[PDB]
Amino acid sequence: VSHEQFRAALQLVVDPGDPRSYLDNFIKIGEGSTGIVCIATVRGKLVAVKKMDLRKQQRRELLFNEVVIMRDYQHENVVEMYNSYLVGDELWVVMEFLEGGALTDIVTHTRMNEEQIAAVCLAVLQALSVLHAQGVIHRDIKSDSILLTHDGRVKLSDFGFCAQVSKEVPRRKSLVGTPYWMAPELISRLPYGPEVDIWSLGIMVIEMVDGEPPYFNEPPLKAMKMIRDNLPPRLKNLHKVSPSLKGFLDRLLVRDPAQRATAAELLKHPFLAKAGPPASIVPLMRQNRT
Template sequence: MGTDPLDDIDLNSLRDPAGIFELIEIVGNGTYGQVFKGRHVKTSQLAAIKIMNINEDEEEEIKMEINMLKKYSHHRNIATYYGAFIKKLPSSNGKHDQLWLVMEYCGSGSITDLIKSTKSCSLREDWISYICKEILRGLHHLHNNKVIHRDIKGQNVLLTDNAEVKLVDFGVSAQLDRTVGRRNTFIGTPYWMAPEVIACDENPEA
């Protein structure tokens, strides 16, 4: 048996983001944390910074998300991973230090934002076709690597200023450990789930 890749990440050994990245404003919430618009101090390049408080109950999920981003974000339809940092907080004794996950900034918001901006009007059919095609490209990349996202929804599909479509938030993703792997756990956002996932259908032929 090989070493579990989760064991390779020592969260306490990560660098402090002070002097490297700075926060500008909060832009939303992701699984396990808030997301900020940030900036690289030296280059002024914008970035999305997801900030999470570290606790033992969620440490495995956090490590899983870092692994997913490191391995699979180098694709046109996945927000690029830039790095992870630990913000040491005074008198926390390491128990409530903050993890900063730094990723590509998508300045045009989410698909949910786009739909809301149209008010009572529907999205144009060619826009819908383009967005769906790009989402499927991203999912195809993940599935080829035996990764299931498990929380595809409007808030987790972002647009760059150049109208590129990017999948984000791998906080509940899973790596299938076999070629014919299957996940039956109830994880994700119920409103966006397929009925068979909500039912936790365990029929292997489904």
């Protein structure tokens, strides 16, 4: 499929026009897999703009999947998209700005308690149960993909790797994700489904408890071989965690995806009863630390 034809299909979907009319004061706040993210001001609300080069993608079709999903799925725990545009060779998606940043910064700089860990898992499982029911697989669940509001509410972001399964095509086979968070069946190149996100969430629980995913200091291909061949990873800090948290994590990090717990199942797990309110996360954020 041609670039001119791909851009053409995307043009049918995005908002027409040049948003450099509506926006100014662009400040780069980071980089992802698919492009860069800036903050900008509307002509006075401030927004986040993700900018992706149509010609520089390993899997260009995923750009399409991204826009269509956030357009079609609004949930309290999912980052809201306001608009999307084509600007030269770039797809721009305009989204709400979340002042609390990403969970990565919390997990690498602080130790979360179980109330805080439970609140983050509850929020993510709520988003995923709704997405999974409609056949949407996120495929990049990790702390970097979890954003926080000023008052400590959790929002799933970074839908640039998502896919949708259906009755007609109920499994994917593509190798998409981030090595250390990838489910064994996905690493192995087997037909997979929504269950891959449950494993990835398990790995993000490890991040929240231990600060890092398993095998993080290994080359990514070596970590993927270990994920694929070995017993499920265990918490380095095990004696430090409750029986509720261990039993919860034991249901996520199940190698056989057919025996892995679903998002709907896990929403009924007693560990999530520990979830604290959003205000419990606030003191973990960079702006409130010293």
